[PDB]
Design a protein around this ligand. Structure first.
Ligand SMILES: CCc1cc(NS(=O)(=O)Cc2ccc(C)cc2)cc(C)c1C#N
Ligand SMILES: CCc1cc(NS(=O)(=O)Cc2ccc(C)cc2)cc(C)c1C#N
Lengths: 174, 174
């Protein structure tokens, strides 16, 4: 992020990305610049039922019949093979279409990320005739080894933000 | 382009993209912002022998055996079907690796773009911790109808600059 971007995001970081952090947990914040309109980036990332369309490592994701996307709905993720996780059950914790804030929590499954909770926010930037997006994503998770959990989780979040960027930029081509 | 980008490119436009324009010709300048390092964009676009790797509409492109990329070498392009051209023979007019300037001329083939000549230049931008590229491409061509030639040529150049952008940005992903 540029100094101006960090300066303009300080409010959103305090509002949506601040945690009460204890030694038993680890947590981080990551950012991704996306050269696409924020309303487009948001339309992609808000689909709690289809994380495989903007994330890596998902073999399948199922939701219940007559699914309704609202707080408390869940998704059943099966991870691709060869990762430190097999399955994950996840709950939509907040969906704020007006402020472009969403977040989820892991509530079950076979994996090593107990009490994982994540928040994603999408931000509009405008300067001269330029319009672009920054996405912020933060998480908190139990810390079982200590540096490995953070290293693994950070790399996944970064790779997934990058995939979101490629999808939105593909859609935004004139 | 932003006002600052246009301001910083004014020199390069005067240096490399100015033409003596007569009513029998048409000409235009187009720009493409690319979110990748300029040395990467340049390594792609300087390959006179492989335009199909950064342009649309090319069925095949052949160069002679023991090809040497230097001024006066040629390429034999076959266009995909359904366009107002079948074949084109093109000559490398200038290759300046130090200044990132290259240009070519059409010297034969079955098409409607007689005396087409093009110049492409690649420009480094740097602000705070951001590094990005702008590519400028200009052409001059005979004007046979008058608005159609410009409309066709402009749309092709714009689409090809966009393809170059997608290729370089794919390569630049962290
Ligand atoms: C393979 C990463 C992953 C994805 C996953 N589901 S998800 O991609 O739909 C949402 C997500 C959860 C946890 C992380 C670190 C990234 C993304 C669930 C788990 C338990 C893991 C692990 N390990
Ligand atoms: C199909 C566009 C095209 C490409 C082409 N060869 S090329 O793509 O390798 C370089 C090029 C030439 C002319 C234009 C307008 C764009 C690119 C030659 C011709 C005569 C045409 C036409 N019409």
């Amino acid at each position: 992020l540029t100094p101006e971007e960090r300066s303009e995001l300080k409010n959103s970081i305090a509002e949506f990305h601040t945690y009460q952090l204890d030694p038993g947990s680890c947590s981080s914040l990551h950012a991704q610049r996306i050269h696409a309109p924020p309303e487009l980036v948001w339309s992609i990332v808000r689909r709690f039922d289809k994380p495989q369309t903007y994330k890596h490592f998902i073999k399948s994701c199922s939701v219940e019949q007559n699914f309704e996307m609202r707080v408390g709905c869940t998704r059943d993720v099966i991870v691709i093979s060869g990762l430190p996780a097999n399955t994950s059950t996840e709950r939509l914790d907040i969906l704020d279409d007006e402020r472009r804030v969403t977040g989820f929590s892991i509530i079950g499954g076979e994996h090593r990320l107990t009490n994982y909770k994540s928040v994603t926010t999408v931000h509009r930037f405008e300067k001269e005739n330029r319009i672009w997006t920054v996405v912020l994503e933060s998480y908190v998770v139990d810390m079982p080894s200590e540096d490995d959990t953070r290293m693994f989780a950070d790399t996944v979040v970064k790779l997934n933000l990058q995939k979101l960027a490629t999808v939105a930029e593909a859609m935004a081509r004139n």
